[PDB]
Write a protein that holds these residues in place. Structure first.
Motif, short mmCIF file in Angstrom:
data_model
loop_
_atom_site.label_atom_id
_atom_site.label_comp_id
_atom_site.label_asym_id
_atom_site.label_seq_id
_atom_site.Cartn_x
_atom_site.Cartn_y
_atom_site.Cartn_z
N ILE A 78 -49.10 -2.28 -31.79
CA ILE A 78 -48.75 -3.59 -31.25
C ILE A 78 -47.38 -3.49 -30.60
CG2 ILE A 78 -47.65 -4.62 -33.31
CD1 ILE A 78 -49.28 -7.21 -32.73
N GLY A 79 -47.05 -4.46 -29.76
CA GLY A 79 -45.72 -4.56 -29.19
C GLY A 79 -45.18 -5.96 -29.35
N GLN A 230 -59.28 -10.10 -26.77
CA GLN A 230 -58.07 -9.86 -25.98
C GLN A 230 -57.04 -9.07 -26.80
OE1 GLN A 230 -59.92 -10.78 -23.03
NE2 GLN A 230 -57.80 -10.74 -22.51
N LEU A 231 -56.17 -8.28 -26.16
CA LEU A 231 -55.19 -7.46 -26.87
C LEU A 231 -54.24 -8.31 -27.74
CD1 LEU A 231 -54.19 -4.85 -24.12
CD2 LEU A 231 -55.94 -4.61 -25.83
N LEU A 232 -53.82 -7.80 -28.90
CA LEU A 232 -52.77 -8.45 -29.69
C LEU A 232 -51.39 -8.34 -29.02
CD1 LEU A 232 -53.83 -7.47 -33.31
CD2 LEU A 232 -53.94 -9.71 -32.35
N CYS A 233 -50.63 -9.43 -29.00
CA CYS A 233 -49.25 -9.47 -28.54
C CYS A 233 -48.37 -10.18 -29.57
CB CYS A 233 -49.19 -10.19 -27.19
SG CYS A 233 -47.60 -9.87 -26.39
N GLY A 234 -47.21 -9.62 -29.86
CA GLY A 234 -46.14 -10.32 -30.56
C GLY A 234 -44.98 -10.65 -29.64
N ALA A 235 -44.10 -11.55 -30.05
CA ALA A 235 -42.87 -11.85 -29.32
C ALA A 235 -41.71 -12.14 -30.27
CB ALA A 235 -43.12 -13.00 -28.36
N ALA A 236 -40.49 -11.80 -29.85
CA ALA A 236 -39.28 -12.08 -30.59
C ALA A 236 -38.69 -13.45 -30.25
CB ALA A 236 -38.30 -10.95 -30.35
N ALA A 253 -48.78 -19.51 -24.32
CA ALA A 253 -49.14 -18.19 -23.78
C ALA A 253 -50.12 -17.41 -24.68
CB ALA A 253 -47.86 -17.40 -23.54
N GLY A 254 -50.34 -17.85 -25.92
CA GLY A 254 -51.31 -17.29 -26.85
C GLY A 254 -50.77 -16.17 -27.74
N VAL A 255 -49.46 -16.14 -28.05
CA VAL A 255 -48.86 -15.12 -28.92
C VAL A 255 -49.52 -15.10 -30.31
CG1 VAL A 255 -46.87 -16.34 -30.01
CG2 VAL A 255 -46.66 -13.96 -29.35
N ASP A 256 -49.75 -13.92 -30.88
CA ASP A 256 -50.45 -13.77 -32.16
C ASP A 256 -49.52 -13.79 -33.38
OD1 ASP A 256 -51.96 -11.63 -30.01
OD2 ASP A 256 -53.24 -13.13 -30.93
#
Ligand SMILES: NC(=O)c1ccc[n+]([C@@H]2O[C@H](COP(=O)([O-])OP(=O)(O)OC[C@H]3O[C@@H](n4cnc5c(N)ncnc54)[C@H](O)[C@@H]3O)[C@@H](O)[C@H]2O)c1
Ligand SMILES: Nc1ncnc2c1ncn2[C@@H]1O[C@H](COP(=O)(O)OP(=O)(O)OP(=O)(O)O)[C@@H](O)[C@H]1O
Ligand SMILES: Nc1ncnc2c1ncn2[C@@H]1O[C@H](COP(=O)(O)OP(=O)(O)OP(=O)(O)O)[C@@H](O)[C@H]1O
Ligand SMILES: O=c1[nH]cnc2c1ncn2[C@@H]1O[C@H](COP(=O)(O)O)[C@@H](O)[C@H]1O
Lengths: 484, 81
Positions: A78-79, A230-236, A253-256
């Motif tokens: 993941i990123g 859809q691909l998993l995305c994280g955010a800070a 935006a759909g962040v996981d």
């Protein structure tokens, strides 16, 4: 049943209260019964999210935007999209990950019949392609009227700047609604064309496949996808009131998963922010941190986090210990925080200090469920910014988020900025990591990372400290000269 | 009131009788509840003299004459000529 006693358990290794890091000990080998490829790397990121590989890109502005996040999700991990950018920029980077699909084009360039051929030449020289579809609006989700490509343009002289040249809808090959890449392979095989537009039942354009990107297709079995594939995305995110807006855009935006980003995560500000998130967006998973002791962990685990980020001053670019005298050696910290968090089912992320494959295997053996790498993933093709040359070698810039260069865009430098040598691509280097992690687990005797941690907690995994001399001998020594 | 015990107290750190200096240890982080600007640096120099900042210029001939002492006093500390 008799197995001779040799080595220390992880509890005995950390019972002398020295500040051990990864280089201070070794794991003792066990009993091989399986091949290295049989080793399962499945990993808990949070209470609900599971990855097929332990690896994570750090939320840093020189490491992690949508291309790094796409490459990390596709390779099995993941990123976490960084936050040294506007709220709308970060939500756009997340939205690029969440709306990626393999072989299909993401964010297509499109024109309209009232554009000039000069617009095709400019969109070329700023993007690098020219196979640009034509729609009635010039946007997307709008009637596909024709296509323009370089062979429609290449014999025009600079004398000609006509409006759109365009081969019309009547002549096109297109896909009707949405297709698996096999029907796309057969259409582009049988048609000899360079583009395959995809339309609606009302003949709007909705997507494109390029023949070039379809020819570059490969399997991604560890794809790390959500329920809607859809691909998993994280955010800070930070812990100030400005972050409550950013958090809404990232949710839209759909962040996981969200990672609250601080150097000392045991504050009233972070606990407030965690309660706010869990009360406004109860579907969203929160990783708090950074914490190095079990008391910090206890506060954040009561605040209701789904995971912990562990580390303080072990980072490659970090100087927080020299300026505030606060931190912990990373092996000790990982062990202690992970031991406390395991009593609650909470996974931790061993963040910082990773330089080798042995460091990853060591951190995973000490109880970390996943490993966050900044410098190790920096200077890849997928990392942000652009390459430069110095001293005859290719470099990319790498920097701490509390370096002056990062925070200028009375104030105390917590980090440093500097060069890293080019690594190639995430798609080629993450497999070297995975293969090395699997071989280390095979030498240790663990058929999975779950079994590795289970052997460490029960005292079957044995350890061994290292003097300075043993670290010297465990390197390369006695040679006149040698290869990298 | 449970705070998990993690780390050494200062008495336990100095109980092994090694020759520790500043670079041999770290302080473990605690629980933030205030902003960094709220931190009071008031300091006793002697039984009677109190400074507003802990810093002192050393009485060395390459460090402290009257201009260094004036700057140090004005910034919150003291200097020794
Ligand atoms: N290795 C590490 O753990 C480490 C060390 C230093 C910096 N960093 C990184 O540097 C970046 C900046 O983080 P940081 O270290 O400056 O900490 P930070 O940004 O969380 O906080 C900076 C300062 O502002 C205060 N603050 C935060 N939220 C506040 C609020 N709502 N109200 C009032 N004050 C508030 C904090 O208490 C601190 O004094 C992050 O990317 C972080 O991960 C990481
Ligand atoms: N209309 C487009 N919008 C966005 N990206 C595009 C578009 N057309 C091509 N690309 C991308 O550009 C890259 C190269 O594609 P391709 O080989 O088909 O280029 P092209 O359109 O034929 O341009 P050129 O004639 O210069 O080679 C691929 O990653 C492809 O997805
Ligand atoms: N899907 C399609 N259906 C029908 N015609 C198409 C389609 N895609 C492209 N064309 C047309 O086919 C011709 C060749 O375009 P194509 O994308 O295949 O090659 P090109 O990128 O222009 O040339 P080259 O690959 O040599 O650089 C152009 O006249 C173009 O308008
Ligand atoms: O400016 C900084 N100072 C201190 N630590 C930082 C800074 N920027 C990032 N970090 C930490 O460094 C980690 C990456 O460390 P690395 O993998 O050794 O390069 C990140 O995940 C952060 O926790």
């Amino acid at each position: 049943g008799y197995v001779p006693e040799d080595g220390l358990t992880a509890q005995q290794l950390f019972a002398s209260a020295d500040g051990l890091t990864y280089n201070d000990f070794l794991i003792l080998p066990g009993f091989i019964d399986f091949i290295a490829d049989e080793v399962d790397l499945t990993s808990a990121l949070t209470r609900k999210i599971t990855l097929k590989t332990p690896l994570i890109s750090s939320p840093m502005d020189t490491v992690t935007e949508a291309d790094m996040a796409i490459a990390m999700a596709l390779m099995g991990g993941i990123g976490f999209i960084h936050h040294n950018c506007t709220p709308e920029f970060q939500a756009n980077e997340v939205r690029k990950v969440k709306k990626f699909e393999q072989g299909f084009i993401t964010d297509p360039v499109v024109l309209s019949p009232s554009h000039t051929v000069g617009d095709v030449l400019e969109a070329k020289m700023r993007h690098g392609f020219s196979g640009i579809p034509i729609t009635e609006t010039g946007t997307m989700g709008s009637k596909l009227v024709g296509i323009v490509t370089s062979r429609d343009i290449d014999f025009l002289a600079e004398k000609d700047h006509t409006t759109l040249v365009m081969t019309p809808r009547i002549e096109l090959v297109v896909a009707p609604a949405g297709v698996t890449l096999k029907e796309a392979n057969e259409i582009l095989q049988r048609s000899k064309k360079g583009k395959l537009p995809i339309v609606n039942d009302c003949d709007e354009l909705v997507a494109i496949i390029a023949r070039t990107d379809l020819k570059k297709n490969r399997d991604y079995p560890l794809a790390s996808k959500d329920s809607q594939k859809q691909l998993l995305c994280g955010a800070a995110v930070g812990t100030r009131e400005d972050d409550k807006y950013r958090l809404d855009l990232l949710t839209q935006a759909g962040v996981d998963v969200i990672v609250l980003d601080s150097s000392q995560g045991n504050s009233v500000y972070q606990i407030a922010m965690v309660h706010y998130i869990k009360q406004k967006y109860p579907h969203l998973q929160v990783i708090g941190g950074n914490v190095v002791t079990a008391a910090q962990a206890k506060n954040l685990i009561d605040a209701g986090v789904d995971g912990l980020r562990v580390g303080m001053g072990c980072g490659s670019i970090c100087i927080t210990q020299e300026v505030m005298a606060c931190g912990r050696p990373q092996g000790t910290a990982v062990y202690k925080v992970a031991e406390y968090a395991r009593r609650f089912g909470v996974p931790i992320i061993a963040d910082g200090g990773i330089q080798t494959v042995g460091h990853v295997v060591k951190a995973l053996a000490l109880g970390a469920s996943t490993v966050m790498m900044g410098s190790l993933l920096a200077a890849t093709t997928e990392a942000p910014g652009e390459y430069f040359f110095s001293d005859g070698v290719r470099l990319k810039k790498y920097r701490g988020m509390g370096s002056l260069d990062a925070m200028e865009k009375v104030k105390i430098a917590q980090g440093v900025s500097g060069s890293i040598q080019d690594k190639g691509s995430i798609q080629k280097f993450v497999p070297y990591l995975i293969a090395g992690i699997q071989h280390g687990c095979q030498d240790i005797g663990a058929r999975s990372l779950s079994v590795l941690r289970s052997m460490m907690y029960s005292g079957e995994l044995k350890f061994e400290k290292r003097t300075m001399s043993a670290q010297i001998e465990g390197g390369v020594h006695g040679l006149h000269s040698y290869t990298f």
